[PDB]
Amino acid sequence: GHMLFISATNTNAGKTTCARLLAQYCNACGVKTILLKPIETGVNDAINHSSDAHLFLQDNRLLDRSLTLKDISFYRYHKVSAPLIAQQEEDPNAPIDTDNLTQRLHNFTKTYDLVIVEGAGGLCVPITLEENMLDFALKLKAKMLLISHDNLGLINDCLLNDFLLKSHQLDYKIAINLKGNNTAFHSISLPYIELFNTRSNNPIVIFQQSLKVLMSFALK
């Protein structure tokens, strides 16, 4: 090992925040961890240095000053769409090559104890006509951490993703990104999360309660 893919149930989940918190925690525990964003849409790197890859780069440069954006993010598009569409429209002669990405990402396992790879869009978002984000995670042989939002509706979103993930050959965890000012989660949604977890071999966790558990998972 070790490599951990991070995806989200939905665009509003806050996966980048969670990825940064987990890598900060791992680093602080002496587990040397890098954050990669191999594919990113909706960017404009001449004008905005606040993309996921830029935030990752900032964190990463605390371990290696020589890193640059192109070392950690490889396919970057202005369009907000799914990567497949953004690619076809902006770079028609350059399909996303997941073999190349697998080599680039796995090279970092020489120099890091943990390589965190953040996806874009969700598990089912297309990268090529043949491959989605989940297919890429499967090719990488990574473990998966799927971040959920904390709003009403999270049960359906978590369980949709759980069904997809349990139906494929990978080790995964679903973690809810619970915000500090959320006055409803515990009384509205948590009761079912607790019931679900009694009946499941793989429980849904709360991210904020689970830094040690998720580091253990990632490094297992």
Exactly one of 16, 27, 81, 148 binds a second copy (CB under 8 A); that residue is 81
Q: Is 28 in the site for a second copy (CB under 8 A)?
A: no
Q: Is 121 in the site for a second copy (CB under 8 A)?
A: yes
- DSSP calls for the chain: --EEEEEESSTTS-HHHHHHHHHHHHHHTT--EEEE--EE-S--TTT---SHHHHHHHHHTTT-TT--HHHH--EE-SS-S-HHHHHHHH-TT----HHHHHHHHHHGGGT-SEEEEE-SS-TT-BSSSS-BHHHHHHHHT-EEEEEE--STTHHHHHHHHHHHHHTSSS-EEEEE---TT-SSHHHHTHHHHHHHHHH-SS--EEGGG-HHHHHHHHH-
Question: What residues are designated binding site?
Answer: 11-17, 37, 41, 52, 118-121, 153-156, 177-179
Number of residues that bind a second copy (CB under 8 A): 35
The alpha carbon torsion through 170, 3, 216, 188 (nearest 10 deg) reads -60
Binding a second copy (rule: CB under 8 A), the pick from 92, 110, 163, 183 is 163
Among 5, 6, 9, 15, binds Cl ion (CB under 5 A): 15
User: Which residues are the active-site residues?
Assistant: 37
Return binding residues for substrate: 41, 153-156
Q: Which does 16 bind (CB under 5 to 8 A by kind): a second copy, Cl ion, none?
A: Cl ion
Please say which residue, 65 or 94, places its beta carbon nearer to a second copy.
94
The distance of closest approach from Cβ of residue 181 to a second copy in the complex, given in angstroms and rounded to an integer, is 18
Known binding-site positions for Mg(2+): 16, 52, 118
**Best CA proximity match to 11, nearest among 116, 169, 148:** 148
Q: Does 40 bind a second copy (CB under 8 A)?
A: no
Residues within the interface to Cl ion (CB under 5 A):
15-16, 152, 154-155, 189
Residues within the interface to a second copy (CB under 8 A):
10-11, 79-82, 84-85, 88-89, 121-126, 129, 132, 152-153, 155-157, 159-161, 163-164, 167, 188-189, 191-192, 195, 199
